[PDB]
Design an enzyme around this catalytic site. Structure first.
Site, mmCIF file in Angstrom:
data_model
loop_
_atom_site.group_PDB
_atom_site.id
_atom_site.type_symbol
_atom_site.label_atom_id
_atom_site.label_comp_id
_atom_site.label_asym_id
_atom_site.label_seq_id
_atom_site.Cartn_x
_atom_site.Cartn_y
_atom_site.Cartn_z
ATOM 1 N N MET A 102 -3.533 11.083 -2.479
ATOM 2 C CA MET A 102 -3.271 9.629 -2.279
ATOM 3 C C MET A 102 -3.390 8.881 -3.614
ATOM 4 S SD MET A 102 -2.449 9.206 0.889
ATOM 5 C CE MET A 102 -2.619 7.451 1.209
ATOM 6 N N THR A 123 -4.271 5.406 -4.486
ATOM 7 C CA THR A 123 -3.312 4.313 -4.149
ATOM 8 C C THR A 123 -3.269 3.317 -5.311
ATOM 9 O OG1 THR A 123 -3.509 4.559 -1.765
ATOM 10 C CG2 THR A 123 -2.835 2.387 -2.554
ATOM 11 N N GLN A 124 -2.065 2.967 -5.762
ATOM 12 C CA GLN A 124 -1.834 2.063 -6.917
ATOM 13 C C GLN A 124 -0.580 1.223 -6.653
ATOM 14 O OE1 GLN A 124 0.216 4.305 -10.211
ATOM 15 N NE2 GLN A 124 -1.308 5.857 -9.685
ATOM 16 N N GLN A 141 0.876 -1.214 0.000
ATOM 17 C CA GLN A 141 0.000 0.000 0.000
ATOM 18 C C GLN A 141 0.898 1.244 0.000
ATOM 19 O OE1 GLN A 141 -2.270 2.357 2.642
ATOM 20 N NE2 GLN A 141 -2.417 3.036 0.517
ATOM 21 N N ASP A 179 -6.946 1.322 -11.777
ATOM 22 C CA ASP A 179 -7.217 0.846 -10.391
ATOM 23 C C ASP A 179 -8.278 -0.261 -10.419
ATOM 24 O OD1 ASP A 179 -5.384 2.701 -9.457
ATOM 25 O OD2 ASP A 179 -6.830 3.852 -8.247
#
Ligand SMILES: [Cl-]
Ligand SMILES: [Cl-]
Ligand SMILES: [Mg+2]
Ligand SMILES: [Mg+2]
Ligand SMILES: [Mg+2]
Lengths: 222, 204, 125, 195, 233, 195, 221, 211, 195, 195
Positions: E107, E1-2, A1, J90
């Site tokens: 983020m 987030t990735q 993360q 994503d």
């Protein structure tokens, strides 16, 4: 993360005299066990005889200094070029920091200058903007190494008057700029020896009624 | 739940001219709660002084263990153990518990009775030896002590001066650590006399 | 939303919609307030052109805002209900946050504030 | 916020609520009143998450006091309990639910009958001759299933409550620092000064 | 987030007396070390700036487009677009630095390490680094990823401090960079033999070298090495 | 990348020279071809520590075997490898190709993959993470090939694998097992890259 | 930072002198160069206690082996004994060693990973400064190095680590093992990080510290 | 360690001055009493920033009330402004333990405990912080309603000193306040270092400590 | 098992130990004696994990009673405390450690001095004028620091204990159902019948 | 296994016919070659759902593009694919090869891998878990190849991928994009297996 925070190391030191104040910082920028730069300044003249440093995560530190410099610019525009007093700057920075209470700036902030009576002032902030005025404050990696030394040599803590049976304390007094710079230089050479993230160079910004002067000193590069 | 910082406390050792000094705080706590202000962390086996910081049960246990081992040493060798040899014994005994270690930061201080050479050493919890000319630090305010020592210390100090330096190093370090303080003891060790002084410090 | 400025200034410096609102009040049944040494009395006129009225259920001219404050009015009856409701809500809101019932001056200042807001808001008379 | 009891007798409803407020390992207060008067003949006791309890109680109090002024009429205990249940039933699928349990004791002046309602934080409403919330019910429900009689007087109901409080003081691990007792009858709401 | 999928390895750079040098291998590394070739990680912006990008290739190509987009925008209603009001390395860096930090604060970072190498209008050498956290720093030598660990130590022997920059020639700096690229080929599993090198010189302008190969490699000694200790054959 | 190919005169063992920790090349001149007997060699893949420990134990067992019962078969060497890999599969991560020459049996190739199973094949190839390929150009391999053909075949196969890997790299090492003896071949990048 | 460099008639190993707990420097001049045997020396990285303990145990067992066989010990014996010990503990003993020596067979240079893997090389480097050191070795190493060239290359590789790695610092230690000669151990071969004079002396006036009680300690029988 | 208690002579407010980050003692000179207005005081316990910022904001909200209503705010109203604010932020991670202490003619001397969980309590005695238990032990043992002002001031000082000694995370110096009909009065900053030895000598207590 | 206090006065040691045994939400007992007589002039109070406490206490009692018979001699309080500490210090690196905290109060007939020892489950021994285990210390130590005097009598020491118990009954969340008090002096061990 | 190869007359697209859920073959006659325009096709790998949703949106964008601005370039089609894949990386797991024929530009091949990057190549091959190979027989592929050569090259490459991969299987489908038009080819296992 993805982790949005990092540690760029470095350590900073503020000391308030009678008619002057100093804000010192090492010039080494690090990530983990690598050196990014041997000379990357993190102590800045912000105008109105205020010097500032936001030590910790360099990105958050750069962002905060940038935002405060901009706060000084807009204070001039909105209040007829009025000089931003160090106490007013300190309150402004509390609001900047607490603004991001739930996504904080990972920095320990120190500002130095003169109060409205012309006496040396140092303010220190936590990451979320709690602040207090002190005559002495170290911040960052080697704060724990420097701070007890300053307690002993600046505030004369645990020193008693020879012969008085430890009844009469060693009297408090203001130090000269020359005596303060000695303690700063010795504080940083000591921290350089025992902290791997401290070294390369020491940049001191001295604030008097005459303005802001700079002094640079080499530190060990290991 | 970090054994090394439950009870708290600090030890510092320094070399001078034909003398060594070793000092400790007197605090034993259960985290935030102060329990005892009379918990000495410095023990002596003949003329060899051992300070131990960390988990207090292991401090007591290792004292009892090194008393045992040095008592048997003296009976078999027909002489008191020397600092250099005792250092190797501490190292051996700690690394024997490599995968179940004592949660301690021991410090050896003393003068070799033959050569008269001042000697100090420090160890990690599994017995790696740190041999140093200048000073050794241990405990919850080790960072604070490193800073005080590295600035205050100079070589070849006289016993009366070395006392002031180590005392100021400990007192100012303990006052910047929550789990250290509640009184302090300084041993000044010369070749054939040892003075023990209790320091007045803030009780908070 | 309907944005039009209905309450605006005229060349002579008057706001006609506010002044025409006073005309609606002048048309309303008479209401009188007299305060004594240890009491206040609110008298209210009821026009007698309405017989076969049920006085039990008909909206009373004097409204309790709280147990200690009352509001009477002259003008549009339907409009009065919106001010009385807002005032009653503010009375309970004051008790909840200040832990004290409203002063008469505070409750007045609130109602007057609502009446003012409707003189320089778009889309409202 | 731990112990809230309720007993409905012949002509009244009795609410007993623990006086202790505990934060961490210290007892901050020993005189706390865990009740709000909703209307002259309706009382609500409450227990649950700190802050939420008083915030919820005062919010309900304000809404019932608003209805009383608007209609110049006292809402029935059944009506007040139904309103309170619906507010809790909204709360449970909120972003952050109110964790508050309540007893509503009221005298219905139309029916001339005392009424006790038990509502949990989910909005689970039930009408009972006697009720409790949390662990207090574990010891008092079976004690009341034995000694409770439907035609009891207020004095009989207070004696039966003393028996419940004595059992709690004996077998419960916490010191709840005794109870404040309040009676709801045709004449309104009064507090028993000594218990 | 990735999470980055296809990535570029180290970008290395240093200042010399009259300008800066920047280099980067032409390889895109996949998941479990898997290799892919044909990727240019040096972006020339105008004739005074080269941008070297490491990390996610997809995010690199996005940044590439932003820089192309930026040049177009600067030309709009700008008579001095090819003169006094031309884009500067300091402007291009500050734009990129701003973007990186506001992306990390949302983020949703660009998973890259960027070095902006160029010469300013007054002839001052410009070298500065920004990464996915928006952390920025400048030094006489700058490198990313493995380069920071292996290239920097070699480049710092040539230019340890600011005072060494005037004494360093382009011939010396280019040799140092080309040597450093070979070391990275030896020791980095995600490196390739083919690389691109760009020189920005105040006097001679921007020189861009493509399809460069690592040469004068030492492998001969490998024949003498047998087993992992006791093996003689 | 490691492969062993049986041909007319015997068998050839080939591998790359790269050892990695993460993306760092710990050793760029690694000898992945190990002698367990004069004419029994193996290719090591997986854990460097695990394969070395196993290869050392197998060498001990074959040295002891030779003392008592004389020269052991390639099958015997494969069996000893399997026994260690199978019985300690829980604590081990070792993939091994065993190649040996007998005057009776000529060239033999055995693979012990991660399972701890044994397979006898004409040739074998493992790439990436100890991953054996079943087909690997079955029409590109013929039985009873020539030395130069075999060397060319392995040289090409490993070069392709180093072009697409990253784990594999550096020089190509080969060991030729025949009646004549043991030959050690090495191919530097400049030769094998242009293929 | 530890390196091994092979030359014409021997092998040379060098190391830095910095010991660290987290970001704090515990020892400014610790010795990472260990004697397994008179002409077999070891450089250790990782857990400091583990490298010292594993070096002394094998060194003890090698001495006993040397007495039993009446022969100078071999580097392959030290290597084999170390790797089998480290493999047994599955990396839980965090010792990363560069093992170099001269014996009747000749001069040898090896590295040992904590999990029990070993390699062979003409030049090796281990520790946090290995990449800084290896960059210098890859740039300047050549076949048929002289002893003077090998010492320079080894000390330069350590210097790269000292300057560019935060885990490495202080002085440079070298040990030179040449065939037919006594191994020469050059402790503090280079000292490029000497603390500069302090601006002020922090020597206190006597009686500065408040004292509650004084007593004489009896250390005699 | 912060305490506030009601007695015949008004309210006594006493606080320590230590601030810690883990086991690190960050400061011994922190001001844990916010002065709000001449008849209102606020203590500080928990997050230093959370207390300092929101209690400085409470002084601004209290000033606005007095401008609008031409009257000083009641302790009840002032405490509820802060408690209603923290309740909005509930679950976001605010950490605050605080007392709003003041005198008004209509309420008399009043103390309100307010915390970040949203609890708002009216009481005669409160102790908040890591050292609250140590303070409570001394206060409860010697607390009388009819204490003299001089004795009450000493008891508050003595109770903080007790907590400063036994609690690792409390210490530095003691700050004393007295709240009456005429407002709050500062009774100085007493360094624990000097205070401890004076108290031990005069009181003859602290026999656990090596004389 | 919660509250165990100890005060060493001029001529005696006083141990106060809570009477409550709580399992789940019920108080099983309100008369529990959390103490064992180790020898005629040595008493040990204990608190911790259920079962472990009594099992440990009785085990120590048996070992001291065994020593007393074997040597026809009473082991000194210092000796008993050192033995008990070593047993706990073994326990902490056992498969399943004893989670027991103890106070040892004894009168040393050789020194004619009362002695109080505080040992936690880790084997952390300390000699104190007054001691406690768990959360007991947090309220009582401030009180003892203030009211305790070294030359106090047994009556003075009991009054100072009453002040500690009153503070605990006020500020502690649990009902520990009062304390059993035992005095250890030159004449042996006696229990204060009414407290 | 999917690949696109540019040759003299245009470009050919090739893919397998197998869709799997775990080890179960959901569809053994899948058409992995999708038309986004008359002479712009793509090969789909990764999520069947994700690739279909993206391919359908791209087809919509190119239909709308053609209406307003006339026939779009292969580069334009690749850009639209990338935009969807990059912006929704994503929530997406799609690897796409885009092959198209222009009379100006002849045959072009673009790959959009998992990252959401775009690459223009002479040929592209993706095997196993959307894993694109970089060299893939670089000396086996030449520029300006014949149609028969190109069909043989892809047939061999895909057949070898099907031999070692369980994900790939069934029939080989190809689409030939040239000036002449669109040709669909199918090769059954019995033809392609014997290679
Ligand atoms: Cl290997
Ligand atoms: Cl499909
Ligand atoms: Mg340094
Ligand atoms: Mg302290
Ligand atoms: Mg204890």
């Amino acid at each position: 993360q993805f982790n949005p925070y990092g540690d760029n190391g470095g350590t900073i030191l503020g000391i308030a005299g009678e008619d002057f104040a100093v804000l010192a910082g090492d010039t080494r920028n690090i990530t983990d066990y690598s050196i990014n730069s041997r000379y990357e300044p993190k102590v800045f003249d912000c105008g109105d005889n205020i010097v500032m440093s936001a030590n910790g995560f360099a990105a958050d530190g750069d962002a905060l200094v940038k935002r405060f410099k901009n706060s000084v610019k807009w204070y001039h525009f909105d209040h007829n070029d009025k000089k931003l007093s160090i106490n007013s700057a300190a309150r402004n920075i509390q609001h900047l920091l607490y603004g991001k209470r739930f996504f904080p700036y990972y920095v320990h902030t120190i500002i130095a200058g003169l109060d409205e009576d012309g006496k040396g002032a140092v303010y220190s902030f936590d990451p979320v903007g709690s602040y207090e005025r002190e005559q002495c404050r170290a911040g960052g990696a080697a704060a724990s190494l420097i701070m007890p030394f300053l307690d002993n040599q600046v505030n004369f803590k645990n020193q008693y008057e020879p012969g008085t049976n430890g009844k009469v304390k060693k009297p408090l007094k203001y130090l000269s700029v020359e005596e303060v710079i000695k303690l700063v230089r010795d504080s940083f050479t000591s921290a350089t020896e025992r902290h791997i993230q401290v070294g390369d160079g020491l940049e001191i910004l001295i604030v008097t009624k005459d303005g802001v002067r700079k002094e640079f000193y080499e530190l060990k590069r290991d | 739940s970090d054994p090394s910082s439950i009870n708290g406390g600090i030890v510092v050792a320094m070399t001078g001219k034909d003398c060594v000094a070793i000092a400790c705080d007197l605090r034993l706590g259960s985290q935030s709660l102060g329990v005892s202000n009379k918990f000495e962390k410095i023990f002596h086996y003949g003329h060899v002084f051992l300070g131990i910081t960390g988990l207090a049960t292991d401090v007591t246990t290792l004292n009892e263990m090194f008393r045992y081992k040095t008592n048997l040493y003296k009976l078999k060798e027909e002489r008191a153990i020397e600092p250099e040899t005792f250092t190797q014994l501490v190292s051996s005994s700690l690394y024997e518990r490599r995968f179940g270690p004592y949660f301690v930061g021991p410090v050896v201080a003393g003068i070799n009775s033959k050569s008269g050479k001042p000697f100090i050493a420090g160890f990690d919890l599994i017995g790696c030896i740190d041999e140093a000319k200048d000073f050794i630090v241990s405990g919850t305010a080790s960072d604070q002590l490193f800073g005080m020592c590295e600035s205050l210390y100079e070589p070849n100090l006289e016993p009366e001066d070395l006392f002031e330096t180590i005392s100021q190093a400990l007192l100012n370090a303990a006052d910047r650590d929550a789990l250290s303080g509640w009184g302090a003891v300084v041993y000044i060790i010369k070749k054939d006399e040892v003075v023990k002084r209790y320091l007045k410090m803030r009780q908070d | 939303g309907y944005d039009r400025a209905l309450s605006i200034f005229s060349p002579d410096g008057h706001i006609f919609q506010v002044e025409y609102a006073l005309e609606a009040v002048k048309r309303g049944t008479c209401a009188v307030g007299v305060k004594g040494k240890n009491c206040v009395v609110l008298g209210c006129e009821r026009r007698s052109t309405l017989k076969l009225q049920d006085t039990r259920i008909t909206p009373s001219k004097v409204s309790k805002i709280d147990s200690h404050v009352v509001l009477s009015f002259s003008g549009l009856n339907a409009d009065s209900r919106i001010l009385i409701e807002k005032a009653r809500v503010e009375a309970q809101s004051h008790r909840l946050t200040l832990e004290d019932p409203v002063t008469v001056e505070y409750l007045t200042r609130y109602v007057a504030g609502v009446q003012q807001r409707y003189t320089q808001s778009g889309g409202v008379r | 916020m731990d112990i809230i009891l309720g007993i409905r007798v012949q002509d009244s409803v009795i609410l007993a609520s623990s006086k202790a407020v505990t934060r961490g390992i210290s007892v901050l207060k020993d005189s706390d009143d865990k009740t709000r008067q909703l209307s002259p003949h309706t009382l609500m006791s409450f227990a649950g998450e700190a802050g939420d309890t008083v915030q919820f109680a005062e919010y309900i109090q304000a809404n019932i006091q608003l209805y009383s002024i608007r209609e110049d009429y006292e809402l029935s205990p059944q009506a007040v309990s139904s309103f309170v249940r619906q507010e809790l039933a909204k709360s449970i699928r909120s972003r952050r639910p109110y964790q508050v349990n309540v007893l509503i004791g009221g005298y219905d002046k139309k029916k001339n009958k005392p009424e006790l309602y038990q509502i949990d934080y989910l909005g689970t409403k039930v009408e009972l001759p006697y009720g409790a919330h949390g662990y207090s019910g574990f010891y008092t429900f079976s004690l009341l299933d034995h000694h409770y009689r439907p035609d009891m007087t207020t004095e009989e109901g207070l004696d039966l409550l003393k028996l419940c409080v004595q059992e709690l003081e004996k077998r419960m691990p916490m010191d709840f620092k005794g109870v404040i007792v309040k009676i709801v009858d045709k004449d309104g709401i009064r507090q028993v000064d000594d218990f | 987030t990735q999470q980055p999928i296809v990535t570029g390895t180290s970008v290395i750079s240093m200042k010399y007396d009259n300008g800066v040098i920047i280099a980067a291998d032409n390889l895109g590394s996949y998941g479990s070390l898997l290799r892919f070739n044909g990727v240019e990680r040096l972006i020339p912006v105008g004739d005074n700036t080269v941008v070297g990008i490491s990390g996610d290739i997809s995010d690199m190509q996005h940044i590439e487009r932003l820089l192309k987009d930026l040049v177009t925008e600067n030309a709009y209603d700008n008579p001095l677009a090819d003169a006094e009001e031309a884009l500067e390395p300091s402007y291009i860096f500050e734009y990129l630095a701003t973007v990186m930090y506001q992306r990390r604060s949302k983020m949703n970072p660009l998973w890259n390490a960027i070095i902006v190498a160029g010469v300013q209008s007054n002839g001052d050498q410009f070298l500065r680094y920004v990464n996915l956290l928006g952390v920025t720093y400048s030094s006489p030598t700058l490198a990313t990823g493995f380069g920071a660990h292996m290239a920097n130590p070699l480049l710092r022997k040539v230019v340890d401090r600011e005072s060494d920059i005037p004494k360093t020639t382009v011939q010396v700096a280019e040799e140092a960079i080309v040597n450093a690229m070979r070391v990275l080929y030896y020791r980095d599993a995600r490196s390739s033999r083919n690389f691109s090198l760009a020189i920005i010189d105040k006097n001679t302008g921007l020189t861009f070298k493509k399809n460069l190969q690592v040469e004068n490699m030492k492998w001969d000694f490998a024949k003498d090495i047998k087993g992992y200790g006791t093996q003689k054959i | 990348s490691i492969m062993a190919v049986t041909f007319k005169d015997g068998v050839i063992l080939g591998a790359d020279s790269r050892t990695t920790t993460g993306a760092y090349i710990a050793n760029r001149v690694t000898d992945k071809l190990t002698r367990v007997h004069d004419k029994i060699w193996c290719c090591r893949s997986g854990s460097a520590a695990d394969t070395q420990a196993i290869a050392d134990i197998v060498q001990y067992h074959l040295e002891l075997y030779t003392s008592q019962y004389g020269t052991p078969s390639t099958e015997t060497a494969a069996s000893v490898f399997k026994e260690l890999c199978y019985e300690n599969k829980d604590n081990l991560t070792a993939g091994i190709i065993v190649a040996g020459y007998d005057d009776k049996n000529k060239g033999e190739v055995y693979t012990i993959p991660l399972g701890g199973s044994v397979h006898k094949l004409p040739y074998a190839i493992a790439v990436s993470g100890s991953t054996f390929i079943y087909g690997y150009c079955d029409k590109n391999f013929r039985e009873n090939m020539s030395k130069e053909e075999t060397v060319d075949f392995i040289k090409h196969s490993l070069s392709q694998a180093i072009k697409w890997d990253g784990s594999s790299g550096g020089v190509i090492r080969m060991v030729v097992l025949t009646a004549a003896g043991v030959e050690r071949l090495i191919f530097y990048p400049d030769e094998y890259e242009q293929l | 930072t530890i390196v091994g460099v092979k030359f014409n008639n021997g092998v040379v190993i060098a190391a830095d002198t910095r010991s660290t707990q987290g970001p704090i420097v515990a020892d400014k001049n610790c010795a990472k160069l260990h004697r397994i045997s008179p002409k077999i020396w070891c450089a250790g990285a990782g857990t400091a206690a583990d490298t010292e303990a594993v070096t002394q145990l094998i060194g003890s067992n090698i001495e006993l082996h040397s007495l039993y066989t009446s022969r100078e010990p071999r580097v392959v014996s030290a290597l084999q004994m170390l790797k089998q010990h480290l493999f047994k503990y599955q990396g839980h003993i965090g010792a990363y060693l560069i093992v170099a020596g001269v014996d009747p067979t000749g001069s040898h240079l090896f590295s040992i990973h904590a999990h029990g893997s070993t390699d062979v090389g003409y030049y090796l480097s281990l520790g946090s400064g290995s990449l800084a050191a290896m960059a210098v070795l890859e740039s300047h190493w050549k076949q048929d190095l002289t002893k003077e060239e090998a010492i320079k290359l080894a000390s330069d590789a350590i210097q790269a680590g000292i300057w560019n790695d935060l885990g490495s610092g202080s002085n440079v230690d070298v040990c030179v093992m040449e065939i037919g000669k006594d191994a020469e151990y050059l402790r503090n071969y280079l000292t490029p990080n000497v603390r500069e004079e302090k601006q002020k002396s922090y020597k206190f006036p006597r009686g500065t510290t408040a004292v509650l009680k004084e007593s004489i300690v009896n250390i005699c029988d | 360690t912060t305490l506030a208690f009601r007695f015949q002579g008004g309210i006594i407010v006493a606080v320590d001055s230590r601030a810690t980050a883990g086991n690190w003692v960050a400061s011994q000179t922190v001001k844990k009493v916010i002065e709000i207005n001449p008849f209102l005081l606020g203590t500080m316990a928990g997050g230093a920033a959370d207390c300092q910022f929101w209690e400085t904001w409470l002084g601004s909200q209290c000033r606005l009330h007095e401008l609008r209503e031409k009257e000083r705010i009641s302790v009840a109203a002032a405490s509820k402004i802060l408690s209603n604010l923290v309740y909005q932020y509930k679950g976001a991670g605010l950490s605050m333990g605080t007392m709003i202490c003041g005198y008004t003619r209509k309420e008399g001397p009043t103390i309100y405990y307010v915390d970040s969980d949203g609890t708002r309590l009216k009481g005669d005695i409160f102790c908040v912080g890591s050292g609250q238990t140590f303070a409570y032990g001394v206060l409860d043992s010697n607390y009388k309603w009819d204490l003299s002002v001089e004795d009450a001031l000493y008891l508050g000082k003595r109770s903080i000193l007790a907590a400063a000694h036994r609690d690792a995370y409390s210490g530095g110096s003691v700050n004393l306040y007295h709240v009456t009909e005429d407002g709050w009065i500062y009774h100085g900053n007493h360094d624990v270092g000097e205070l401890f030895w004076k108290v031990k000598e005069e009181e003859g207590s602290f026999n656990n400590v090596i004389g």
